[PDB]
Amino acid sequence: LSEVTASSRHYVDRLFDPDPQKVLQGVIDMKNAVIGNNKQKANLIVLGAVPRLLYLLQQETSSTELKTECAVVLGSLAMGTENNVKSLLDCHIIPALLQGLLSPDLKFIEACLRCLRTIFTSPVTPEELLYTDATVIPHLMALLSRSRYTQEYICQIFSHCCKGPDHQTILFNHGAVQNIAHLLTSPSYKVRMQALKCFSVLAFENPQVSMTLVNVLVDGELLPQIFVKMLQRDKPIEMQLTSAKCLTYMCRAGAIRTDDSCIVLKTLPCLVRMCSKERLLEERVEGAETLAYLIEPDVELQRIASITDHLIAMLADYFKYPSDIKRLDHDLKHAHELRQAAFKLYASLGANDEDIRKKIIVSLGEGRPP
Ligand SMILES: [Cl-]
């Protein structure tokens, strides 16, 4: 490791200072020292700052300011390497943060939830820890709608830690769909985005939840009506793609009909707009694969898609060379993903109609099949 120098030790020592004012300023200086330095994070974790910080956040005498600043620093350490997250987990930070979530003060709750978000988002953290203690999910649900930060953080934690049907149903029984639906009308886009993500992963292959989503009412509008608005071009591209995913999944589960207006006039047209040359490579791959997921079961959708906004022409441009230098290198390295996506959509488009396969064969290269 990098040698530990007197500066780092002085930061950790100032926490043990006898004057409370000096301790508070020491934790503040510690937060300002780990902003960009992952090495400073590692040095302070090895010097034992995390146990002391947790103790200072546990004390009854500690002011709300000191508790908030200590939680902030603990989150800043969790923003570093995976080794740091493992060290913080080994110091039992999640239990302490869960006790901190019992606080009335909102800023302190936000700091603890920010730390929990970074931890649960990190790969080294097992998702089962979220469900190992049954009371944490109800407690998080209760805090879901106190601030935009609680909404965003708890949505991120849930969306990253759902993991499919079993504990997805655990989350559902605690009122996930009803409590998270209201966030889609929030004045904060960051919230509205994250809620969307929660729904997309929550309804991927769970027909039961999809049906529930069809009848959920948020601010006088049925939830699919909110999704359709989030397909509009004025909205950000992410918002659109994710909305389309939700609807396609709801359509695949049976909650929405393949002949429904939201699918043929909004969702599918939106997905072809994701396949344009102007779109990013990742967006083209996801739009194409999601459209293939949508159109695979129904022949009528396949035909409609084949005649929508020169889709088969745009797909041909997946095989053409790109036309910011790091993005260009990234697009030449990941071009295989784009070509593979094009073939997935071709396979779904031409599954039942030979004339569509003839159209694609002609589009992919010069020459007409016999
Ligand atoms: Cl942050």
Residue numbers in the entry: 14 to 336, 343 to 389
Q: Please, what does the article write about this entry?
A:
The CTLH (C-terminal to lissencephaly-1 homology motif) complex is a multisubunit RING E3 ligase with poorly defined substrate specificity and flexible subunit composition. Besides the reciprocal incorporation of Wdr26 and muskelin, another known alternative assembly path of the CTLH complex involves the mutually exclusive incorporation of the Armc8α subunit or its shorter isoform Armc8β (673 versus 399 residues). Both subunits share the first 378 residues comprised of seven Armadillo repeat motifs. The remaining scaffolding subunits, Armc8β and Twa1, strongly interact with each other and with RanBP9, again with nanomolar affinity.
To identify possible oligomerization sites, we solved the crystal structure of Armc8β after crystallization of selenomethionine-labeled protein by single-wavelength anomalous diffraction at the selenium edge and refined the structure at a resolution of 2.7 Å. The crystals contained three chains (denoted as p, i, and a) in the asymmetric unit. Remarkably, each copy exhibited a distinct conformation, thus demonstrating dynamic flexibility of Armc8β especially at its termini. Chains p and a are more similar as reflected in an rms deviation of 1.04 Å after superimposition of the Cα atoms of all modeled residues, whereas chain i adopts a more compact shape; in this case, the rms deviations are 2.82 Å for the ia pair and 1.69 Å for the ip pair. In terms of oligomerization sites, analysis of the structure with the PISA server detected no significant stable assembly, which is in line with the dynamic nature of Armc8β′s oligomerization behavior. Apparently, the high concentrations in the crystal promoted the observed interactions, nevertheless, since chain p shares an interface with both chain i and chain a, it is tempting to speculate that these two interaction sites could correspond to the two sites identified when analyzing the self-association of Armc8β by SEC–MALS. Not surprisingly, the overall fold of Armc8α and its shorter isoform Armc8β are very similar. However, in our structure we could model an additional short α-helix at the N terminus. The conformation which Armc8α adopts in the complex is more closely related to the less bent conformation observed for chains a (rms deviation of 0.93 Å) or p (rms deviation of 1.05 Å) of Armc8β, than to chain i (rms deviation of 1.94 Å). Human and mouse Armc8α are very closely related (overall identity of 98.51% with only two substitutions in the crystallized region), and the C-termianl extension, which is unique to Armc8β, is very flexible and therefore could only be partially resolved (5–9 residues). It is more likely that structural differences arise because Armc8α is being present in a complex, whereas Armc8β was analyzed in isolation.
